[PDB]
Specification:
The structure is a homodimer of 31-residue chains. Chain A has one domain. Chain A is 84% helix and 0% strand. Chains A, B: It is found in: Nucleus.
Chain lengths: 31, 31
């Protein structure tokens, strides 16, 4: 598999972690 | 240009918007 696939996977994982962080912050503040 | 490029661009832009949101939240709370 091309190392390019690994970089796209990293971008997806980072996206998910950011979204989940934001989701947890929304729950904390009641949003 | 392949529509695939547009999707990767969307992923990058979303990543940037999430990071910038988190960065602004850190500034708000003093982190």
């Amino acid at each position: 598999m091309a190392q390019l696939e690994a970089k796209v996977e990293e971008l997806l994982s980072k996206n998910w972690n950011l979204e989940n962080e934001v989701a947890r912050l929304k729950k904390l503040v009641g949003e």
